[PDB]
Amino acid sequence: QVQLVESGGGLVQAEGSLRLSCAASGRTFRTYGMGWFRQAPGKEREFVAALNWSGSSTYYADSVKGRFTISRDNAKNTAYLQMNSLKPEDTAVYYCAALRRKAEYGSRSIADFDSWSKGTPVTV
Amino acid sequence: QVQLVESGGGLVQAEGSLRLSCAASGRTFRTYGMGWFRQAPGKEREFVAALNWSGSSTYYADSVKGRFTISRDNAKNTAYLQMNSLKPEDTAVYYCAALRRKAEYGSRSIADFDSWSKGTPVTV
Amino acid sequence: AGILAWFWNERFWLPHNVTWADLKNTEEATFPQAEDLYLAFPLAFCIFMVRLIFERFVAKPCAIALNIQANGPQIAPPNAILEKVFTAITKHPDEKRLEGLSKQLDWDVRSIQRWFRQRRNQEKPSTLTRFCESMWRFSFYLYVFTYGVRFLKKTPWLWNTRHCWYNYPYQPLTTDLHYYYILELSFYWSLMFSQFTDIKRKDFGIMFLHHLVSIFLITFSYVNNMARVGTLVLCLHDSADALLEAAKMANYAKFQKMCDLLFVMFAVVFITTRLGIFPLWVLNTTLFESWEIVGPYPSWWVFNLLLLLVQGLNCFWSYLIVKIACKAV
Amino acid sequence: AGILAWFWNERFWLPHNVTWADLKNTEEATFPQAEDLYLAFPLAFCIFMVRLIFERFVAKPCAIALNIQANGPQIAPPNAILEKVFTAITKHPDEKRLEGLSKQLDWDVRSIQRWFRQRRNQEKPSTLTRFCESMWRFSFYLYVFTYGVRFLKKTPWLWNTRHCWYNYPYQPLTTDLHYYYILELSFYWSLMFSQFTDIKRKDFGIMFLHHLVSIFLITFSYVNNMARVGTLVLCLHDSADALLEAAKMANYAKFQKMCDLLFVMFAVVFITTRLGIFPLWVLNTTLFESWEIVGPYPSWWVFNLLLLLVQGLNCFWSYLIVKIACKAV
Ligand SMILES: *C(=O)CCCCCCCCCCCCCCC
Ligand SMILES: *C(=O)CCCCCCCCCCCCCCC
Ligand SMILES: *[C@@H]1O[C@H](CO)[C@@H](O)[C@H](O)[C@H]1NC(C)=O
Ligand SMILES: *[C@@H]1O[C@H](CO)[C@@H](O)[C@H](O)[C@H]1NC(C)=O
């Protein structure tokens, strides 16, 4: 029930650092659990990170844990994804989504997120 | 909470007959008590006729009773006012209004009717 | 779920070309809804708690200071045959039963009557509890009647009953009317609570059918937005109930003359209100004016009948009064 | 009106930066509201009616066919001094009281003890009513526990309690959870109805404070949307209550061995569930996980305390069991 706009995408050298931002135009951004997905050339979409409304609990994927940090700012109605020690496999299109008020915490499936976004390409 | 448009106005000879129509653009016309008021040159507005939502009970003014007949059609969402044996004193601007959901039946005051209309001039 | 939708058939309760969706609450006006009748049970529980507190802490000291017997009933003299008859045959012998008992026991009728009266007093509750209950009923009825008079004196339909149906069912619900209806329903539910489970050594007779009918009417008139005509009935039927309790209190306090005066005044008020004013006012505005203003609708054929039923019951009560008042003269 | 708004301070119940306006019902999700707890009283009245019907028509014939004494208590031998002491001094003498009565009356302790036991049986209700009430309690508790197990076996937070707070308070209300909470509240209100007014010759002690606390918790957890963690407590505390009633029924039916077996099984289940599982599961997910997931909020400091209070009460009950089971060995 929110509109998501992403930013911070671009092309960086190997072992770089990026900070993707996802902003929402509404007062209900603080009552949804946000999430970030990736889509590499071929195969299908993959889960990257997610967190609940308060931001106290965050969970990532097995292959990305320890390098990506997902956070949120309810005052500014935004979410941030920080990348450290990038790898060539990280070149993909990144999408910002949100739990649809009924999916339980910890979901790692495409169908559990309703409000999608345009996404940004990231190239290493 | 309805929009009222009047018709049937015009100029007629003495002891004529007129049929003023008041139409509403909405599905709630059948739940309000309609009314017709007159405004002669000078003085102020005067009460002419009124009726409830079902049309079973109708009440007129003392000086117009026996000549004017007020009716309604909920299927067509309209109200009709028929005049018989017109008099020169009937030349005035006629307004269509409706009880504002809180005024009791039998009210004969301007403040008891909310949804007014443009009105039509009638000349004898 | 489906059966509830079947029961609430919009072509049965509401008039022609009127649907429940027209009565939904909005920012323009507030209309009564069934969901507003769920607070009646919590308010009845609160009223029952307050009634218990009033009886135990307020009415009992006053009764003690008024020289009311604080002990229980007496003890009947021992008798094997009389005890066997009381446990097996009956508890309240009539004249023929008294004659049969006198013939069987070879004892005087007066002695057997006194023994059975003592046994009935043993089975009956003590005077203290009845006095406290009568005092509570008197206070509640007096407050209800006073509030009803104060509310109705300013309403427009009290003087002209035709205003009860001119804008029906599109009549907004005011705070005072909602409070009155909720208070009445809460009091009736409190009476149900005190009747059904407080003491099972009671009688389920005319006064229980009367209670059930009253709760039926108050509920199905509130949900049907027939609240402008129900207030008249509620205020009319509570006028005489505030004097019977005072008469009972006077009788219990060994004040015979005051009891007779209060009872005759209660009889006059009861007869005048429920035999002279009711058929000519409420049945008049229900049978005739409603028919010519709202038109024919099915639920009408129900409600009137129940009102007639109530009238019949009150006619019966008039009988039970008309003889007793004759003894009071 | 204003005092209700003061009591429902949004900075006290809900977590930080959360207001009641965020929990308003909409087309996207359904959240619990206080107004949904008003149906509990009508459902409790219906449950009380069904309980009366079951006791009078179903349990009583079974008890009669089970050779249960259908008569009342016995009659104590007459004694002026003993009757005066019973009416004035006490009704349940202890060892010192028995010795004093023996010294005063110059009678054997056994005779006085038997007389006082007979008097207590006269004051106590008959075995038939207690058997019927125990059967009703057993049936209701068994049904409640079965439904709780069936509902919880598919829920996601039963196996991982951290799911009770991950999306709190933005957790939709399902039909099953609402039905469970309403049924539990209705049963507790039915118990209140059967305790407060059905018979006033009862005791208002530990089991009344326990009832009041249970109704307090169920209400203020439902209105606070803490319904995912309340179901665990409701299903945990109803596991052992279905065996005590069976043990009582076996005891009343002159089945001593079955009563001992049922009571020892009940003791084992009660101790394991309310001393071993409760502190390590419910207090674990309430004290620690809630603090680290939801953060600090004032209402927390209330709820935990009450839970601890409940634990203490159940500890007391464990005492009253641990000796009795020793006699049952
Ligand atoms: C016993 O004799 C007194 C009973 C009191 C009756 C209370 C009923 C009030 C509700 C009346 C509703 C009637 C409206 C329907 C008319 C068409
Ligand atoms: C007696 O020993 C059994 C009592 C049963 C207790 C029922 C209470 C259920 C509601 C629990 C709500 C707790 C939630 C608050 C935790 C922070
Ligand atoms: C609550 O919101 C305010 C302003 O919206 C913000 O400054 C503050 O950091 C927030 N606190 C938490 C715990 O989210
Ligand atoms: C009810 O409405 C229908 C169609 O809207 C109309 O044909 C009919 O005359 C109306 N009846 C009454 C009594 O208003």
Residue numbers in the entry:
A (entry chain B), B (entry chain D): 1 to 124
C (entry chain C), D (entry chain A): 2 to 330
Publication passage describing the model:
Ceramides and dihydroceramides are synthesized by six ceramide synthase (CerS) enzymes, each with specificity for different acyl-CoA substrates. Ceramide with a 16-carbon acyl chain (C16 ceramide) has been implicated in obesity, insulin resistance and liver disease and the C16 ceramide-synthesizing CerS6 is regarded as an attractive drug target for obesity-associated disease. Here we report cryo-electron microscopy structures of human CerS6, capturing covalent intermediate and product-bound states. These structures, along with biochemical characterization, reveal that CerS catalysis proceeds through a ping-pong reaction mechanism involving a covalent acyl–enzyme intermediate.
We, therefore, used a camelid nanobody to solve the structure of a CerS6 dimer at a nominal resolution of 3.2 Å. The cryo-EM structure reveals a CerS6 homodimer with one nanobody bound per monomer on the luminal face and a lipid adjacent to the dimer interface. The cryo-EM density map revealed the presence of a long density extending from near the membrane midpoint to the occluded ER end of the central cavity, spanning the entire length of the narrow tunnel. This density was continuous between protein and the unknown molecule, suggesting a covalent modification by a lipid. To probe the presence of covalent adducts, we performed denaturing intact protein MS analysis of purified protein samples and identified a +238.45-Da mass shift. Notably, this adduct mass agrees with a covalently attached C16:0 acyl chain (theoretical: +238.41 Da). Strikingly, the shape and length of the density in the cryo-EM map is also consistent with a bound C16 acyl chain. A covalent bond is seen linking the acyl chain to the imidazole Nε of His211 (TM4), an absolutely conserved histidine that is required for CerS activity. The tunnel is sealed at the ER end by the TM6–TM7 loop, revealing how the chain-length preference of CerS6 for C16-CoA is determined by limiting the number of carbons that can fit in the acyl-binding tunnel, in agreement with earlier reports that this loop determines CerS acyl chain specificity. Furthermore, the C16:0 chain covalently attached to the conserved His211 fits with CerS6’s selectivity for palmitoyl-CoA and suggests that this species could correspond to the acyl–enzyme intermediate of a ping-pong type reaction mechanism.
